[PDB]
Every structure is written in structure tokens, then in C-alpha cells.
Amino acid sequence: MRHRKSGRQLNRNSSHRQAMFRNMAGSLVRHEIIKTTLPKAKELRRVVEPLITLAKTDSVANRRLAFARTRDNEIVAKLFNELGPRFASRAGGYTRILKCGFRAGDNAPMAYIELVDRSE
Amino acid sequence: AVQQNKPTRSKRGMRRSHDALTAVTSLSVDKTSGEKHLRHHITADGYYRGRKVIA
Amino acid sequence: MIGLVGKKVGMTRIFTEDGVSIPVTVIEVEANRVTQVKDLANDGYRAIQVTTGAKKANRVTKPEAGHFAKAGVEAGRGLWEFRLAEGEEFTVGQSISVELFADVKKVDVTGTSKGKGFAGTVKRWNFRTQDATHGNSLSHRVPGSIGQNQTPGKVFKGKKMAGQMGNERVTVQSLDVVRVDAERNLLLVKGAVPGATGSDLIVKPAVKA
Amino acid sequence: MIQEQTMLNVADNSGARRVMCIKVLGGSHRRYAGVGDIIKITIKEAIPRGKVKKGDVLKAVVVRTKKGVRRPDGSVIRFDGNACVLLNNNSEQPIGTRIFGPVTRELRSEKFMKIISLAPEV
Amino acid sequence: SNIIKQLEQEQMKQDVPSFRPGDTVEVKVWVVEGSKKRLQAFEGVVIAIRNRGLHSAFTVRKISNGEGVERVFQTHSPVVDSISVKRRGAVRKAKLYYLRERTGKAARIKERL
RNA sequence: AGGACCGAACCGACUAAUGUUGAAAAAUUAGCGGAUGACUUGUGGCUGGGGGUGAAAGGCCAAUCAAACCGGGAGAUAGCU
RNA sequence: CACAGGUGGUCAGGUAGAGAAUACCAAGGCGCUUGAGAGAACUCGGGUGAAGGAACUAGGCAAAAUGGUGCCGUAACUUC
RNA sequence: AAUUCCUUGUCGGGUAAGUUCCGACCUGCACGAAUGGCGUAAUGAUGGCCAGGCUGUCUCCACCCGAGACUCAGUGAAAUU
RNA sequence: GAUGUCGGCUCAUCACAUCCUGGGGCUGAAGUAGGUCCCAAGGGUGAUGCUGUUCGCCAUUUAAAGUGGUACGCGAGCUGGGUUUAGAACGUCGUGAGACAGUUCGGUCCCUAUCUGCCGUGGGCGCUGGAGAACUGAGGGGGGCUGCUCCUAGUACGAGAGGACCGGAGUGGACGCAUCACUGGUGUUCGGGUUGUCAUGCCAAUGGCACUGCCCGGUAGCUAAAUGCGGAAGAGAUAAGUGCUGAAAGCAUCUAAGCACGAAACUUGCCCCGAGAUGAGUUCUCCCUGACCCUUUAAGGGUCCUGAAGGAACGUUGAAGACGACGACGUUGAUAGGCCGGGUGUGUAAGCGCAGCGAUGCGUUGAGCUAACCGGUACUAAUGAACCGUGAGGCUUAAC
């Protein structure tokens, strides 16, 4: 059974998923849109959107927490300096998933995930 | 482990009676670009809902 | 007697003043509207058909809408029947409520048990596992034998094998009615009842008594 | 939960130090014995000049388990080890004259009121 | 679960003292001896607290008459008459299960100031 | 000092599982034994089939061994299928 | 076979470590030529289990357990 | 007794209960003195037996983590008949 | 031109020549207990020490530890201890090579299931216009065990010792089903501690990696050891048995006419499935009432207009699930994520101050974080479409 459980395991071990989403969240922050499989998005939301809600309030403690989650000081700075302020009035839902067809090498449901504002 | 008589071509056909694919029948048309696409998927030119989302 | 249609809310306890904790299942039984009465002349048997709860109007297909419209009642989440005893009698549109159970002391609760998916014989039928070591080869939870030999030459029907478990209709009989709270539409019965939280329950006065 | 091959301590001065459960009696295929159940034991370890000698087979009542007991409240009482009182095999009466350690209210049953009266607690 | 929430609310005690694991408490539990109802004290160190609203509990560990005993008291039970704190212990964990392997001097708990 | 001891490389191969149309015509994994010796390895040489070589098992002699492989006698013979 | 096997020699850095053990790294080299989902039984390879504790079994097979250094201490027996 | 058929001989030990074990007896079907007898420190991936420890071996399974299985896309066998 | 051997294991299934529990007759049956025979297969019918063992012998259970069939049931389910290959040794026999159901030590168990069978789970069609529900119950299946205590009643009975029938009540054991309120387990998706090492320029703070590195706790879910419940009472027909009236055959006689009783068997009652019950049922509701043409002229084909009730598809999903399926929800919306508040878990975060030579302590501070939980909230994603499905439903005879 899997009753009332959460979290896709995505055919990986826990270390691997954690590393992968750390990379993928860094990618989404710095590019503001990435293309990934539909199931790996929808798991990025549970990772990225808490980072923006964390970046709402700037403090040393908060930045150190973000750095712990995203071991990337450029990403931390962008969170707290652009995405924090940018989403200050939005109550979650900072990202947007757009189904985009299928991959050619494995027929994988592909999707775009992007920040809702995306400088537009 | 293994069969004891060769199955017939009739039994191939019967087993495969469930193997047929289903077509979409169901292309949606974007408001602005007017081009066809898979329901809930962006268009080939990057439209969805009738707004550019990719470019 | 007839019974009522409720919804499983959860479980909790009642502490009695002499220091006994009674586990209870909280079943909320809103008003059950009678939507049809079946009788010998028309239907060949005696029963009432009830509805309960509420349903979004956009989800009510107009066959159902017309059926509810005849009875003059609002749409519920479903329809259930209760065979009628010889003395019982109701009328279409009558609203039956929980205080029916005011003085019953035993109910039979019927629900759909939790669905366990495709289950092995160990979980589904309590088969004893074979040895984990001592030479066992790929055969730890497997079912073992399933038949005799050439003389039946077949597996008998009804053999216990793996397969779908749960998600089926289940009745637990003779449950103590701990409290009937008319104001809140609550029935509290002692013990566990089939199903998950939020599922439908059919609550009837105990047949076996 | 005392089953066959369980080693129990002895909560009476009958002389035994360690006894081993040999049969959870009182039913066919009966598995466990809780507080208040009669088990049959063998004596594995006895002090030198006691009233029972090692290798004896006799009955006993479990007075403490570390699986514990459930009270009707829902509360649970656990001990740090399993113990029993040796009982004469024919008349299930204690062999000892002192009882050590607390016992539990499940013994108040007209059959173990000796043990309750002699016990230091509960 | 609003309705279970208030079903439980109607039924929780309102005066449960605040204590923490490590504290020494005595608990007065009602004891019935046939016709007589008596109040018996079980005193020890709180080694665990399960706090779940009406289903709250706490484990109290004792060394009684030679060997250790621990009761899991169901807070909000009417069997528990009263709880009192005898001394306040200073520990860092929330579950003192390691005290089960300690005895005597090795089981001491610093007082909390 | 030592056919000493413990323990890598190295050389073996006691046990269990897995594999058994294998990743492999004997391996993998977890343990295991020896590890200055009657050791182990490189490169060349030498011994040939009723023969060799053998701390001996009918072991080994090119995934072949109570008598190698290849070609010939030879289309041996076969009251048997 | 682009095969988890076999194949002699030489060089060999740091931090812990007795070490060429092992852990993590450096220089350097790779990610093993099918991938994407789901999160059934059952299989394989692990982790953890209340109370018991060999009751298992042909047999403790397997697992679990022990493990280092200094120091104290150490039995029968003995070819010393 | 790596030997005794009868035989689980008999007696003692060890267990709650012991065809094994260990110590005796001798009634050696059918031991016996370099195709060595009898003992023996140390040693053995040696054979039997008994303890303590230790535990999912079991009472009796429960849950989790990964790789398959299942589904989709690409490729695409086999034994057998 | 191969039909795997014993035992254990894991699953069984049937017979009755019945071990228990149930009914009864006779007793050399006072009671308690038996003995023996008849009826009865509904359910139940041990786990151990030894030995490879079935068996046996034990030691303790139990209400009882049935007896047989089933290729001495079961190796394309498992084991391989024994047996029964090749090494070796002993006793023995043989000059020897070797041999012995004599012994002793060691000794490769392959199979991805086509078909039948079986457990699950779907698609197609049919059921006669289509659809959405709710049913009936023909059939199947499941369950169907028993202890002990107390009262009756120390009453009957007995010379005492002993000790009832019958009738009730309460607690068990095994077993099955549901569940997670509790008590626990697990919890590599939560928090903390700690070791080695590498990195973030460094201090501090963190991250990686070493089996989740090692651990200590733990949310939900799932689960047993946890907790609720249940195997009936009652009918109907009987078996062995016991009778009533009653002749044949002035008597008699349970039977021949007729009339009763009588058991865990049988049929119901309890629960679940179930109209492919092709014998395809019923009940209620909903929708569609436009033309035209050609020929075999007929339940005939085409054309145009129309497309309804519904359904599917797609998406967001679920205490549903291998996949289908099933259930919720799609902007008129809480379906999921997020966000907000709470809860829970870990236990006093960072930064700073202070004390101390320092490690560290202390305060800010039960602080900080907190997964699957609970209450909310359209912030994101659930798109207008489109697709399928039609246009009033045959014939005959009765009734109205």
C-alpha cells in the first residue's frame, strides 16, 4: 500500500533525489524556466516554492538556511534579492507547469516549469 | 515452461485483438494562434490558452 | 427495523466516570430523506429508498434530478434501500433522523473495507511462511503446494490464492451504541467499523441481538 | 508474554532463582501467559538449602511481566523483568512464605489472595 | 474533524499541571477495593510524554521494592486524580529511555533551575 | 631464530546465498585459509600416448582423458534399432 | 560478444591511520551505449523491530554478536 | 570403538524429557601390536557433543529502503511444437 | 528415445470403519464416572527432548491429540538430513582387482507457463430505441469448534465418601473478520547528538561522503503483540431412538391407515457475491416526435439538416489501484501542490551579549525548524472547444 503517502521516489535513492532537486531548484531559480519531465516538475514545486516563501524575509538565519538547502550562494542571493521582493504579495503558487509534449529518446511526458512572473 | 503444441494463427489474432492503438480524435484549437495541439499542452509555436508562453 | 445511512468521521474515546475508556467510532448521520417507497403492488416487495447529504447541482445528471424531483427532496450523495418490516411504514419525502436509534443498544455497521490492493497469500489468508534460511530457495512467502497430484489433476475451485484484498462490503455486527446525539447528528458506537474516514456506513439495529 | 523456553525470575523465598517456562497451560495451542496465568516450569537455579531443588517440575503463576498489563483506563503497567511465584503442583498454593517485589491487581481472584496479602505493594 | 475535536474538548481536564520529561511527579490514581475507593500514589520520574490532546499520556518510571516499574498514565483519565511535581529535572532529550539501563548513581538527574 | 604469529599485495578456495536459456561452458557477493615459505610469479627450455608427469585424485597432459588430438586401414563390425 | 572473468613489471601525493588496511580527498580519470513512469503480490540485496530467546533445523545453516591500544590479571594440562 | 549385528545392550552423568554425547562394564557377530597397538602437549576452513553470549533461525511475522517484476517508448531472443 | 526416492516444510482435499463435541439403546448403569453398540463428517483434532527418520520412546499439554484414501497427496512449491555415483577409512570377505542396504566422514536440486486448472482483474458483444440510477434473488460461496468458573445445589443420589441431570449466567483458549481510539513496532520523506575526512576564501555556520557513516528520538500511513466484533438463538424436515391410538392375527403390537417427538448432519436463519438467471428480470427517472432520393422493394440503402439524455476523452487527483477499473473534482471550483494558521515531532537554532584562560556554560529562548496530519485559502494547475452517442423504437395475437 501507499495510503496517504507523499513524495515520488522517481527510481532513485534518497541521496540521489535530494541532490537532484537541489540542482534542479538552482536551475529554476537562475533560469526562471526549465524543461523537465512532467513528474520531476510537480516535485520541484514542493522544493522550490518553500525556498521563495523562505526568501520572503531576509535575515542571516534565513539566508544560511537557504544556503543549506541550495548550496549555491548566487542562488541564495537571487532568492533573497529578487524573488523574495518580487513575490512579496503572492500566497504560494510561484511556479507554473506547462505540459509540452513528449521526449524523443524515451517518450517521456515533458513539461516546462517557470516562475509565474518571469520578468513579464 | 513451454508449449506442447504450436498455437495457431487464430490464437495469435485472438490474443492481439486487444493490441490496437487508439487515436486522439480530439485536437484542440488555440484561440489566438488557431493551431491544433494536444488538450492541456502548449502548441508547437509556444502558445497555450492563446498566449505566448515560450517564444 | 430500518437503518440509517451515515458517514465515518473517525475514532476517539469516551472516559466513563468509573475510569473506563471506551473506543468509539463517530458516525455522523444527517437527515435521511425518503425518496421512494416500494410496496407489493408495484415493486413486489416492501422497502424505502433514502438519500442523504448534499450533492453539487452541476454533478446531478438529470435522470437523477428528475428522480429526486418526484420525491420533492434535495439531491443527496446516493440512494440506499432498506427492506421494511411488517409494521413499519414511511412516506415519500419523510425525513428520518438519527434519534431513530435513541434506544437501540446494538447496531450492525456496514461499510467498504480499506483496499489493500493485490495481496499475497500470507497477508490475504494468513499462510504460514516457509523457512527464511536452511536452504530455502526463492520460496519464502510463496504459497507452497496448490493441489494433490495426477488424480485430481486440477486445482479445486475456491483454492486460496493471492489476489485483490479489501475494498469490499463488510458488516460488523452487534456494536454497542454508546451515545446518540440528536443535535449534532452523531452516533457513537463502541469499536471499529469498516472503511476509511469519510466513507459511507449503513447502520442498522442488530439483527442477531 | 511468557512462552515456552522463557526464563523467569522467582518472586518468592521458595529457594529458586531462575525457572524456565515449560508449558503455557490452560488451552490447546495457547501461546502466551500474561500476569495471573498459571504456567508449568522447571527449576534451573536454586539456592543450596531451599525448599525446592534444581530440576523440579512444578506450576507457577506469573506475577510480573515486562510486556505488562493494560488497565481498563487504557493505561499500561510494565516491569523490568518477568517473575513468577512457585505454586504447589497439586493444590496451586504458593510454596513460599515471603513475596518480593510489587505485584499487580490481576491477582485479586480468591485464588491468589495469599500472594496479594504477602506482597509488599499493590 | 471539527466534530471529533469538540467531542474531545468536552472531555479534557482543564487543570493538568505543566511538567517536562525528567521531572519527578507523583500521580494519585483511584483504586477500588470492592466497595472501598482509595487514592494511591505512584511517584517517579517522567521519562516520556505523548501529548495528543485528549489522548495525551506520560510514562513515569519508578524503582519499587527492589525492581523498576513504569506506568503509562493516560492523562485526562478520571482514574488519574491529580498530578503533582516534586522536583524539576534538567535533561536535554524528550524521551529518557536510556534511564532503563541506568541504576543507582548512574540514574541521577540534575535539578533544573 | 622460526616450513613462528597477526595482517594487505600475492597465492589459494572451507561455508552460505545468488546465478543455472548466467555478466561467466565454475563466476559474483559476504565471510574463509596461507602469506620468508615444502612459497609465489615472469621468460625461455625439457619430458608424448600404453607414453609422459603426478606430496596419488585414475589427477593432469590446450573447456577432451581406466589411455590425448589429427589423418588413414575404413563404407571395421552391429543375429541390434 | 564493446563479455562483472584472466593478464607480468614500474610510479605512487594529502588528512586521519602501524600500514600499500580503511575512510575522505588531490593530480588525473570517469558516471559503466536503453531510457521515462508507477510505487501490486512475489523475488533479490539491505535497514529496523514489542514480548520471548534456538522454542528453528538434519545441524545455530544463515543472521546477530565479539573486535583497538595501554595496563592489571589468567586455569587444567604440557613435549616446558 | 571411523570396528558391536542384535542394539536405542546395561549402568552412571548431563535434560523437564537424550537412538547422539561423555564416563564405565565386557557379552570383541567381526580390536590388537610398523597393511603398527596404546596414549599424547600443540595444531587443524577436521568429526561428534554441551554451555554462556547473541539474535527475525523460530513463536509469527510488521514496516521501511533500494534493484527487478507492472506500465509507456526503442530494440528484440529461447527451449518447444 | 527417463513415470524423481523417504521424511520434514508449505498448502491441502475427500471418505467414515467418529478422537472430541451432539443425539440415543442396553448395562454386571445408585451418583460421579464408565463399558458396549447404534445414529451423526458441522466444526475442531498439540507444541517438545532423542534420532535422518515415518514410527517409536519420552516429558508436559488438550475437549480431543481420529483412522484411512489422495502417484505411502504435494521437489515445473521448498528442503535434501537419509538413501543411491566418483575421494577416504574401519570391521568383514576375497590371493587379488574389488565387494558388503554392514558402518564412518565428505560430497552441483535446472525450468522466463502455451494449454487446462485456479485466484484476481479488465475489454468486446448480447440482453431488441438510447441513457442514468436503485433493486429482486435463481443460484453460489463463507461461517458453523470448545474449555473453565459460578448459580441451581452439597439439592437429587449415596451407608458414608463422593456428587448430578436439566436450566441459566459470566470469563477464556484457538480461529476468523474489521480497525488504528489506545499500547507498541516501523518510520533512508522530520528534529537532534556524534566520529573521520573533503569542500563552501577563512572564523563561525553549514553541506557532501563513509551501510540512513554511526546513532537517539519520532508525524502520517501501514501494522500486532493492540482493540472491537462474530460464529448463534429460532424455525422446517428428519437419523438412531422413544412414543400415541390401532387392526392384520377377540390378545397383543410405534405401523399396515392415521397422529406425535427427536442431533453440531440436512434446509433456512447470520454474512458476502450475484440477471451472460442468453430463463439476460423489475422499479423509478431522463432524452430524441426534420426533410429528401433510389432500388431487391424491405426491420432496404444513401443524401442533407440535425446530435439530445448521457457517455468517453483530456486535465487536477484519491485512505482506489500492477494495468485497466473504481471514486472525487475542473473556475458556477477546494481536486492536487503551494501559502496561511494550528497540531505533532525533536528539544532551548542562528546571530548577539555575558561569565570563564579556555573547552564550555548562561540569557535572548522551550527557542528554532517540523513529512505524508487538521482547519482554512484560488496563489499555480485543473480551457471555450472538440469527439462518441441520434431524430421516437419490429412483427403477431389478445385485452383495453
Nearest-angstrom CA–CA distance, D96 and C67: 79
B1 touches strand H (CB under 7 A): yes
- E2, C10 Cβ separation under 8 angstroms: no
Burial of A52 (0-12, 13-18, 19+ CB in 10 A): buried
* Placement of cell 479489501 in the chain: C166
Number of domains making up chain C: 1
Contact C193, C10 (CB under 8 A): no
State which approach was used to obtain the coordinates.
Answer: cryo-EM
Domain ranges of chain D: 1-122
CA distance C78 to D80: 55
| Closest Cα in chain E, distance from residue D29 (Å) | 31
- Count other Cβ atoms within 10 Å, centred on residue C147: 11
Largest Cα span, chain E: 49
Burial of E36 (0-12, 13-18, 19+ CB in 10 A): exposed
Task: Say how far apart CA A10 and CA E27 lie, in whole Å.
Answer: 51
Edge to edge, what strands does the sheet with A109-115 contain?
A33-37, A109-115, A95-102
| Nearest C-alpha neighbor of E75 from the set C17, C22, C188, D74 | D74
For C79, counting Cβ atoms within 10 Å of its Cβ (0-12 exposed, 13-18 middle, 19+ buried), the class is middle
Contact C19 E8 (CB under 8 A): no
- Strands D83-87 and D7-10 turn out to be parallel
- Give me the sheet containing E57-64, strands edge to edge: D69-70, D76-79, E67-74, E57-64, E37-50, E24-32, E80-87
* Domain assignment of residue C116, given as a range: 1-209
- Alpha carbons C203 and C171: distance in angstroms, whole number: 9
Report the gap between the CA of C118 and the closest CA in chain A (Å). Answer: 9
Q: Resolution for this model in angstroms, one decimal place? A: 2.7
DSSP state of C94: P
Instruction: Please tell me whether any atom of strand I lies within 7 Å of the Cβ of B26.
Output: yes
Q: Which nucleotide is nearest to C138 (CA to C1')?
A: G43
> CA quadruple E18, E23, E24, E30: dihedral positive or negative?
positive
Reported for A19-26, long-range contacts at CB under 8 A and 24+ positions apart, including other chains, are A21/A47, A22/A69, A22/A70, A22/A71, A25/A51, A25/A69, A25/A70, A25/A75, A26/A70, A26/A72, A26/A75
Side chain identity at residue A38, one-letter code: L
- The DSSP line for chain E is -HHHHHHHHTTS-S-PPP--TT-EEEEEEEEE-SS-EEEEEEEEEEEEEE--GGG-EEEEEEEETTEEEEEEEETT-SSEEEEEEEE-EE-S-S--GGGGG--GGGG--EEP-
Taking only Cα atoms into account, the Rg of chain C, rounded to an integer number of angstroms, comes to: 23
Q: From CA E76, how far away is CA D40, in angstroms rounded?
A: 40
Cell matching residue C92: 415519500
Q: What is the DSSP letter of C156?
A: P
For chain E, the domain total comes to 1
**What grid cell was written down for C77?**
450523495
Distance CA E65, CA D102 (A): 7
* Distance measured from the CA of protein residue A68 to the C1' of nucleotide G19, in angstroms: 38
* Helices and strands per DSSP (H, E), number in chain A: 5, 3
Answer whether D61's CB lies under 8 Å from D43's CB: no
Q: How far apart are CA E18 and CA E26, in angstroms?
A: 13
Domain assignment of residue E110, given as a range: 1-113
Q: Is C38 near strand I, with its CB below 7 A from some atom of it? A: yes
Q: Is the CB of A39 under 7 A from strand I?
A: no
- Our measurement of CA C132 to C1' H19, in angstroms, reads 29
Could you give the 3-state DSSP secondary structure of residue A1?
A: coil
Q: Rounded to an integer, what distance in angstroms lies between the CA atom of residue D12 and that of residue C38?
A: 72
